Amino acid sequence: ELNVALSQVAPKMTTAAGGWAAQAANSAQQSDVCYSSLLTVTRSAANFPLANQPAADMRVYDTDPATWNKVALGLATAANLVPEQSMDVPFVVGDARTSFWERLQAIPMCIAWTMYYHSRGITTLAWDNAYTDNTNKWLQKMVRNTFSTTQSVGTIIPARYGKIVCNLYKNMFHRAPAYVATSVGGKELHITHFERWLPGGTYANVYSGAGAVVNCFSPVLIPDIWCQYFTAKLPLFAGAFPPAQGQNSTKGFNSKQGLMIHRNQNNNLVAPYLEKFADNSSYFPVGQGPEINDMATWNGRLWMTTGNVQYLDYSGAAIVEAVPPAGELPVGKQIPLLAGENAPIELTNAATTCVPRYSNDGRRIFTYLTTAQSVIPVQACNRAANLARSCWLLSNVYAEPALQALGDEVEDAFDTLTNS
Amino acid sequence: GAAIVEAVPPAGELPVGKQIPLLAGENAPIELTNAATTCVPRYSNDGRRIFTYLTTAQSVIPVQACNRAANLARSCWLLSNVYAEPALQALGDEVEDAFDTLTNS
Amino acid sequence: PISADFSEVENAPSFLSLAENTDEVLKPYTGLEIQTIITNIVGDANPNQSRIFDQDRLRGNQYSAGGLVTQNAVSAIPFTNLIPRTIRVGNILVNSANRLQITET
Amino acid sequence: PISADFSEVENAPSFLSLAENTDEVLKPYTGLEIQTIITNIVGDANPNQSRIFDQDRLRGNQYSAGGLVTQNAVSAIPFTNLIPRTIRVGNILVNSANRLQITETNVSEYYSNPIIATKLSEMISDQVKNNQFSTWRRDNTSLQGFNAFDIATINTAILPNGLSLESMLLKLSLLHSIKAMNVDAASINRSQYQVIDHNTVPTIGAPAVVGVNNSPVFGEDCGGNNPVYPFGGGTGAIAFHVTLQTVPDERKSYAIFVPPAILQATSDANEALALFALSMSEWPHALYTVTKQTTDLAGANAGQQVFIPTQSTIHIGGRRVLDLIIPRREIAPNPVRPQAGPDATAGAIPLAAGQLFNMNFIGAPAFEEWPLTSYLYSWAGRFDITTIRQYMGRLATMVGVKDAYWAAHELNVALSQVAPKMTTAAGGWAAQAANSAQQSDVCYSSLLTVTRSAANFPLANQPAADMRVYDTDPATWNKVALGLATAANLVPEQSMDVPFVVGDARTSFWERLQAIPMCIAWTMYYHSRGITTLAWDNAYTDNTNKWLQKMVRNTFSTTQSVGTIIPARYGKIVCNLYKNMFHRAPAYVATSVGGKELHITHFERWLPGGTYANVYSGAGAVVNCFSPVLIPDIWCQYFTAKLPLFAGAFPPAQGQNSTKGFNSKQGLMIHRNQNNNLVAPYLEKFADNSSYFPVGQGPEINDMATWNGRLWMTTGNVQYLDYSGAAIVEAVPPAGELPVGKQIPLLAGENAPIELTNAATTCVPRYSNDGRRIFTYLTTAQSVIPVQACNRAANLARSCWLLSNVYAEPALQALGDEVEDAFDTLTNSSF
Amino acid sequence: EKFADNSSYFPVGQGPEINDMATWNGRLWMTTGNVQYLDYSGAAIVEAV
Amino acid sequence: GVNNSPVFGEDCGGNNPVYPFGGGTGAIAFHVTLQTVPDERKSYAIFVPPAILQATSDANEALALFALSMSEWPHALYTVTKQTTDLAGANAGQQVFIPTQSTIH
C-alpha cells in the first residue's frame, strides 16, 4: 500500500472553462506531476548518476543483517514473524492485473487527501510558503502536524492530522487501510502511509491554458466525479450538483442556517452567505485559520461555478496569488476518445471543491460575483429559486423534463413489488 | 384545444379600469394594477369547460411556480403593510423587531 | 454518492462527523472490488468491452445545465506509473526535453 | 390456462399477486411440460419409434366467431437456433442477401461462492516445503503429474473470488447444442428448419451435416482451411508444455494445468485435450454450419440449404493464447514426449494452413507453438455428443458440474433460441417475403432484437455486449483441479449426476421448448404496462417522464456492490412471474457480496443497448406500437399454470353467453372525449384526469381494463388515437389488424389458423413515446355491443381453441438417472 | 456592537440596533475633533460630510 | 528493459552499470563463513538461509532476488518500451517509459 502511495503519480490540473483541458506537447508543466497526497514529486535537477541527493518524502523502516541473521537460524522469533502458508500470500503477488489494481487503489487515497486539503481552504501558496516565509503561528502549525516531523529514538512517529486523513478513509469508504505495529513510548499504536510523510515540497497547484501557474486554489489533483462516485458517505461541502430542470434542484444555505452575506456593493461585488467572522473579517488572528464549515464551502463553490468569479478581499482588492482568467475552474486531463464516445460538457470533469479561504498573507479570501449577476444565487440561497448545473446520470440520477408537470405522491409501480 | 363560441380578447388583455383625467403630481396605473383579474372563464355557453392555456415554452416558469420552485413577478399597490422589496434579497436573522416590541408586539 | 436531488445534499454528514475515530473491523479496499464500480456502470451507449485494455475510463451519460443528454462521455482515470521518456510531439516521436522525477524514502 | 367460460376469466389471478415473491423450492423446467401436450409421447423414453420430425407444432380444433369448427388447425413452435444462410426464393435456392445475427457476452470475473485451501494444500506447506528449511535439501514432492516446483508456485496467494465454471461450461453447453443436429432425421423437428425460411421442406432420410467454415455468403468461411477467429481476424496460439519453466518468461500465469482426470484410458483420450482447449480459450473458434437436404413446398427442387446455428455466433471468450501444462506420468525429473507426455495430436482434418498441417501432427515438444483456430479446426468433425457426455462425466468426478451446467444450459437457451418478430394481419398466418431484411429480422426470448453484423467477416467492430456472464480464471482453475482448493459449488460428484440433456439426441427439440416460458414471462412483463415499442427504444435517456427511465434503467444489469454483480431489479419480477406462473424455478448461480449470498438468473443479467421486439406490417413496413410482442398468444396461455387476468382466452360460445367485459362496478369508466363519434372502453378512473402522464407516473397495472382494451381491439376496426382523438407519432397498423404468428408449410388434413387464433391480442398500447396516454376507440355506432358486453347485457363472438387444461406435475427422471438397471440393485450397498 | 463586523451593509430587514453603550462611545470619538465617517472598509459615502 | 533510456543521462552505465542515485557500483562477496570476509565488515554479513535457496526452482535467481531485496533500490533504471501509434494511426513507433517505482531511493 505504500508503493501505491508513492508510485501512482498524477499530472496536476489545467484551468479551463468547459471540460477536458491539457497542456502541450513538450513542456515542463505537462510532465509536472503529483502524488496521491496532493504533493508535487521532486524532479531531478542534475544529470544521472545524481550528484546532489534531495530531501526525503516518506518514512520507512529498514531490514538489517544483525536481526535477519538470528531470525534465519532459529535463534530469534518475534511477534510479527509467525510463519504461515503459501496460500496466505497476498493474491496481488504474481497476478497480471496488479498494474490495473494499483491504479485503482490510489484513487481513494487522493479522495481522503482531497477532502483533507479542501475542508480548510489554505490556498496552495499558503501550503508552499509555510516553510519559505511565514509569520503566522497557525500556518506553520498546520504543516508541522500534518507531516511526520517528530522523532523520539529510531521509530517512525505517526503524524497528527494524518489520522484525520485515516479517519476520512474509514468513515467514508468503510474500509481500513493497511498498517504496521509501532511502539513509541511503550504504547502500541498503528501507522499508515497517511501518517508517514515528510514536510516540505511544492503541492498540487493548477496550470492555466497558456501554462501559467494558477496557485490560488486549494490543492486539487483529481476531478469531482472521482470523489463523488466512489464514496459511500461523502461530506456536505463536496457533494454532486443535482440535475438542472427539476423541482428541488440546486439551492444554497442562507442565514436560516446561521450564515451571513458580505455584499461589498459599492464596487458591484457581493460574496456568498458565509460563516460569521469573529475577528476573521479581513485578517485572521495570529494562530487561527478558517473554520470547518460545510454550509459555507458548499455555498462558495456554488458561486465559483457561475462563470465570472473574483477572489479578491474583505475590501475588494487583489490578493498576491495567481487567479485564473475567468470562471475557469481546474478541469481534468484529456485523453484521446474512442468510437462512439464523447468528451465532458460543462464543469463535469472539473474540480469545484477547492474554494480558497486563507491567503498567504494570513488574509481571508472572498468569492465574489457582481451585484447584478448574484441576484439568482442569493435567491437560491434563500430557497426561492433553483440553479442549473451539469451532472452525471449514474445509477439513481434521471434526466429531468423541462415542464415539471408533477402528479400525486407515492408513485411506486414495480417498486413495492421489489424490496420497497 | 379548439375555439369557443365566445368573444376572446386579442392578447393577454385583461379587463382594466376606466381612465379619468389626472391631476398635478399624480400618475396612471402601470401594469395590471387597475385590472380585473379574478374573472376566470370556466363554463362556456355550450355547457363546455373552458381551459386557460399558455404555450409549452412560456409555461415552464408558472409550472415551477406552482411546484413552489420559483417565484413570479407581479405588480402591486404599496398600501399599509406592503413594502418595496429589494432586488438582492440579502436576508439576515429572524426576529427583526426594532420598535415593534416597544409597541403592542 | 451522486445527488439525485438537493434533499440528498442536505442529508449529508459533516466533516467533523466523518473524521472521528472509529473502532470497527473494516476490511482492506482492494482494487479487485474497485474494478467493478468502474465496469458495472449505468449507460446504454456503453459498448461493455470485457478486456482490461478498454475498461479504464469512467463512462457515462451527462445531463447539461440546459437539459440535454450527452450519451457516452468519459472522465480520464488520472493515475499512472509511467514517465514517457519519448513524447509524441508533432505527430512523431521525439525524445523528451524534461528531467526525470525522483523520490526518496 | 385457457378459459371454459367467463366465470374463470373473471376469477383469474391478478398481475400483482402473481409477481410476488415465492419461498417454495421448485423443480427445474425440463422442457417436458410442453412436450407431453404437443406430441404422441406422454409416458417415457422412445429411441427412434417416436417420429419427432412430424411432431413439431401445436395442434387442435378451433371455433370461429361464426359458429364453425375447424378440424386440425396448427400453430408453429416459434423458436429455432438456425439462421438460413441459403434461402429458397422462387422454389430454388439462392444465397442470403442478409447479414448474420451475432451476440456478444460481457465476460468478467465476479465474487462467486468462496474458496478455501484443503488439507492437501496445508499438507504441502506445513510438511515437505517447511521441512526443506532445515535439511539443505531440494527434493521433489511431486503430486500426480507435475513438478514440486510447479505445485509450489500454485500453492500460493489465492484470489478471494472463488471460481465459477460458467464460461467453459457454456462453451461445452454450446458446442453440444451445435453437434446435436447430426444425430438423426426423425429426432429433430422440421418446423425449426422452417421458422425463418418457411418456403422449405426438409427430408426424412439424409441427416444434417454439421460442417465448419463452409458458409457461402458474406465471408463466413473464416479461413475455410486457413482458419482464423470469426470475431477478430487472428489465429491464436497453443503450446503444450510439461513444466512452467518452458512457458517463456512472458505468460506463465495464464498457464493452465490440464488435470489428469479428464485424460484417462477410457476414450480417444486426446480429443479431451481439444475439448479442454476449446472450453478454456475462446468461442467461437470457427463458424459452424448445418447443411441439410431440403425441398420446396410441392417437392421438386431438392437441394441442400446451409444453416448457421445461433450458438456459433455468440462471442464469449477472450483467451486466444493457451499454454497447457501436461501431467508427466508418475514421478520424473525435468528433461516428442521429452518428459513423458501422454499425447498431443493435431486431429483428423488435413488443414492446409499458414503453419501447413499435413493431416495429423503428433507433436508435444517443449515450446513449439501451433495455431489455435487450426488446432480446433482439426477437432471439429469429431466432437460427437456421446464424447462430450463422457467428458462431462469425467469433469463431474472432480468438480461439481450438476447445477452449473444447468445454469449454463438455460443461459445457452436464453441467448440461443431466437425468433422472427411478427407480421401484422387481420386473420391468421401471415409471414414475410424472401430475400428481405424482415424475414431474417429476429428476436430473443427476452423480446429484444438480435444484432446482426454490420460489415463483412472477421470483424473489427466488436458490437455492444448483451449479457453479463462469469468466467473461469486460469489461476484458480490450476489449484481447484489439483486438490489445493475447494468450494461449495465445486464439491465433486459422479457421472450419474450429469444432467439429462447431455449426450441425448433430443436437445434441439427440448431447448426450443425451454425457451417458450422465458418468452411467456417476458411477454407478461412487457404487457402489464403497455409502453408500445418506441417508448422502449429511446427510453433510456429521455428527459421527459422520469418514470420511464427508471423502468428501462432497472430492467437491465448495470449495478454493483463490492466487486460482484448485483442482479437487476424488475428481472426478479420476471423470475417471480416464472416461478408463480409455471411452478418451476429457473436455474441461478451464486454471487456473494460478503457473507450474504444471493442469486442471479438470465432474467437479471441482460445489458442495455439494442432495440426491442418490433412488429412488421403485411407490406414489410414497421408498426412500432402495441407492445414488444413475439410469439402468438396461445403459447402464452395454454402452457401455463397461472396466467394473470389481462391475458386470457376469450371463452367459447356455449349457450347465449360467450364473451363479456368489465364495467363501472369494478371501478372503471368510459373516456368519452370532445367529439361524439368515437368512444373508448372502460379504462381506469385516472384516464380522464391525465391525458398525458405526469413525470413520475406511468400506466397503472389494471387487468380489468387491459382485458377491456384488448376486448375492443379484437373487434377489427379500431384506431389508437389520443385523449382527444388525434394521431400519435407511432406507426399504426393499416386497418383493424393484429400481430399474427409465422406461417409454416402445412401437411395433409391439416389447416391454417382462422381468425385471431394465432395472434397476439394482449399487447394493448397504453403509453405513447411522448408520454401521452393512448386510447383505443370505436365509432359510437360500432361500440354499443362492446359497451353492453361490458355491462353484461350482450355478448361478443370471439374465436378460440378447443383444447383442455391438464398441466401435469414434474417427473424428475427425464431420461437421466435410469439407475433401476439390474446390475446396480446388487451393487447398491457399495453405492 | 458585536454585529458591526458581521454586517458591513445591513440586511433588508435589519437596522441599527439601539445600543447606548456604543452610541455614547461613538460620540465619545467624534468629540475628539478629527474624525472621518467612512465605511466598513474606509471608503467614502454618498452623504455630505 | 533496463538502462535503455535515451536522454538526460539515464543510461546509468548503459554497458558499465552504476547506481542512478550516486556514483557507485557496490561489492558482493559470497563467503561460506565469517572467517573468510574482508575482516572489517563482519558486523554486516548476511546469512542466506537454505530456504531462500529452495524457494526458486533455479535456486540462483533466488540469491539475486535476495541481493536485490537486501541491498539498494534502485540498482539500475528500468524502462518499459511499448509499440504505440498516433491519434488516427499513421506513425507506428515504440515509446520508452520509465516506471515511477524505479526512481525511489
The shares of helix, strand and coil residues in chain D, as percent rounded to the nearest 5, are 20, 15, 65
- Which residues, in sequence order, are bridge partners of residue D600? D589
C-beta neighbour count of A317 within 10 angstroms: 10
C-beta neighbour count of C62 within 10 angstroms: 27
C-beta neighbour count of D541 within 10 angstroms: 20
**Which of A263, A266, A276 lies closest to E6 in CB terms?**
A276
Q: Which residue of D has its CA nearest to F51?
A: D133
Q: Alpha helix locations (H) across D481-582?
A: 507-514, 516-528, 534-537, 546-555, 572-582
Q: Which residue of D has its CA nearest to A94?
A: D253
Q: Which residues of C, range 43-82, sit inside 8 Å of F by Cβ?
A: 80-82
Pair A377, A272: CB distance under 8 Å:
yes
Task: Provide the greatest CA pair distance for chain F.
Answer: 66
CA distances from E43 to A317, B31, E40 (A): 13, 40, 8
Q: Which residue of D has its CA nearest to F57?
A: D149
- Using the beta-carbon criterion (under 8 Å), do A403 and B67 form an inter-chain contact? no
CA distances from D74 to A225, D68, D630, D754 (A): 58, 16, 17, 10
DSSP one-letter string for E1-49: --STTTTSS--TT------HHHHHHHHTTTTSS------SSS---SS--
Residues 6+ apart with CB under 8 A from A53: C104, F21, F22, F105
- Using the beta-carbon criterion (under 8 Å), do E5 and A279 form an inter-chain contact? yes
Return the residue matching grid coordinates 436464453.
D414
Pair D80, D195: CB distance under 8 Å:
yes
- Using the beta-carbon criterion (under 8 Å), do C4 and A397 form an inter-chain contact? yes
Number of helices and strands (H, E) in chain A?
Answer: 10, 7
CA distances from D321 to D318, D348, D375 (A): 9, 22, 12
Which run of H or E residues covers position A14?
strand A14-15
Pair D477, D178: CB distance under 8 Å:
no
Rounded CA-CA distance B54/B61 in Å is 11
C-beta neighbour count of D354 within 10 angstroms: 12
The burial of A272, by beta-carbon neighbours within 10 Å (0-12 exposed, 13-18 middle, 19 or more buried), is given as buried
Rounded CA-CA distance D475/A327 in Å is 52
Pick from C65, B25, A58, F105: nearest CA to D543: C65
Pick from A140, A146, A137: nearest CA to A119: A146
Q: Which residue of E has its CA nearest to B97?
A: E14
What is the gyration radius of the CA atoms in chain D, in angstroms? 29
Rounded CA-CA distance D210/D311 in Å is 13
Go through A381-410 and write b for each residue having 16 or more CB atoms within 10 A of its CB, e for each that does not: bbbbbbbbbbbbbbbebbbbbbebbbeeee
The burial of D625, by beta-carbon neighbours within 10 Å (0-12 exposed, 13-18 middle, 19 or more buried), is given as buried
Pair D255, D325: CB distance under 8 Å:
yes
- Which residues, in sequence order, are bridge partners of residue A310? A368
The DSSP letter of residue A207 is B
Interface test with B, best of A269, A369, A386, A387 (most B CBs within 10 A): A386
Pick from A169, A191, A188: nearest CA to A180: A191
Task: Provide the greatest CA pair distance for chain B.
Answer: 61
- Three-state SS annotation for D561-616: CCCCEECCCCCHHHHHHHHHHHCEECCCEEEECCCCEEEECCCCCECCCCCECCCE
Rounded CA-CA distance D194/D211 in Å is 20
Interface test with A, best of E38, E40, E47 (most A CBs within 10 A): E40
Rounded CA-CA distance C13/A233 in Å is 7
Residue type, D683: L
- Using the beta-carbon criterion (under 8 Å), do F9 and A48 form an inter-chain contact? yes
Instruction: Compute, in degrees rounded to 10, the torsion defined by CA atoms A20, A26, A27, A31.
Output: 70
Resolution in A: 3.2
Reduced to 3 states, what is the DSSP secondary structure of residue A342?
A: strand
- Three-state SS annotation for D375-419: HHHHCCCCCCHHHHHHHHHHHHCCCCCHHHHHHHHHHHHHCCCEE
- Using the beta-carbon criterion (under 8 Å), do B98 and E9 form an inter-chain contact? no
Interface test with A, best of F2, F71, F101 (most A CBs within 10 A): F101
Pair D742, D198: CB distance under 8 Å:
yes
| Distance spanning both ends of chain A, measured CA to CA | 40
The burial of A301, by beta-carbon neighbours within 10 Å (0-12 exposed, 13-18 middle, 19 or more buried), is given as buried
Pick from D465, D413, D471, D419: nearest CA to D442: D419
- Using the beta-carbon criterion (under 8 Å), do E11 and A262 form an inter-chain contact? no
Which run of H or E residues covers position C87?
strand C86-89
Which run of H or E residues covers position D720?
strand D719-720
Q: Does C40 touch chain A (CB under 8 A)?
A: no
Interface test with C, best of D103, D106, D556 (most C CBs within 10 A): D106
Technique used to solve these coordinates? cryo-EM
The burial of D516, by beta-carbon neighbours within 10 Å (0-12 exposed, 13-18 middle, 19 or more buried), is given as buried
Chains near F, with 3+ CB pairs < 8 A? A, C, D
Interface test with F, best of C53, C79, C82 (most F CBs within 10 A): C82
∠ CA C47-C49-C51, rounded to 5°: 165
Q: Does F59 touch chain D (CB under 8 A)?
A: yes
C-beta neighbour count of D44 within 10 angstroms: 8
Return the residue matching grid coordinates 366467431.
D65
Q: How far does the CA of residue C50 sit from the closest CA of chain A (Å)?
A: 14
**Phi, psi for D728 (deg, rounded to 5):** -120, 170
Q: Does E47 touch chain A (CB under 8 A)?
A: no
Q: Does E11 touch chain B (CB under 8 A)?
A: yes
The number of residues in chain C equals 105
Task: Tell me the HSE value of A252 on the side-chain side, using a 13 A CA sphere.
Answer: 34
Helix pair D703-710, D516-528: axis angle to 10 deg: 100
Rounded CA-CA distance D54/A203 in Å is 80
Q: Does C62 touch chain D (CB under 8 A)?
A: no
- Using the beta-carbon criterion (under 8 Å), do E12 and B98 form an inter-chain contact? no
Reduced to 3 states, what is the DSSP secondary structure of residue D94?
A: strand
The shares of helix, strand and coil residues in chain A, as percent rounded to the nearest 5, are 25, 10, 65
- Using the beta-carbon criterion (under 8 Å), do B67 and A247 form an inter-chain contact? yes
| Distance spanning both ends of chain C, measured CA to CA | 36
Residues 6+ apart with CB under 8 A from F17: F3, F25, F75, F76
Pick from A321, A292, A302, A217: nearest CA to A261: A302
Q: Does C45 touch chain D (CB under 8 A)?
A: yes
Pair D479, D241: CB distance under 8 Å:
no
For C37, the grid coordinates are 464500480
Task: Tell me the HSE value of D206 on the side-chain side, using a 13 A CA sphere.
Answer: 15
Q: What residues of E are in contact with residue B89 (Cβ under 8 Å)?
A: 12
Residue type, D666: Q
Pair D608, D622: CB distance under 8 Å:
no
Residues 6+ apart with CB under 8 A from D509: D35, D52, D56, D187, D188, D189
Q: How far is CA C55 from the centre of its chain?
A: 11
**Phi, psi for D437 (deg, rounded to 5):** -60, -30
Pair C103, A41: CB distance under 8 Å:
yes
The number of residues in chain A equals 420
Q: How far does the CA of residue C62 sit from the closest CA of chain A (Å)?
A: 4
Pair B29, B17: CB distance under 8 Å:
yes
Return the residue matching grid coordinates 496488479.
A98
Residue type, F55: A
DSSP one-letter string for D731-776: PPPSSS-EEEPPP----TT-B---SSSSB---------TTSPPP-E
Rounded CA-CA distance D771/A406 in Å is 13
Q: How far does the CA of residue D544 sit from the closest CA of chain C (Å)?
A: 10
Q: How many CB pairs under 8 A join A and E?
A: 26
For D539, the grid coordinates are 427510453
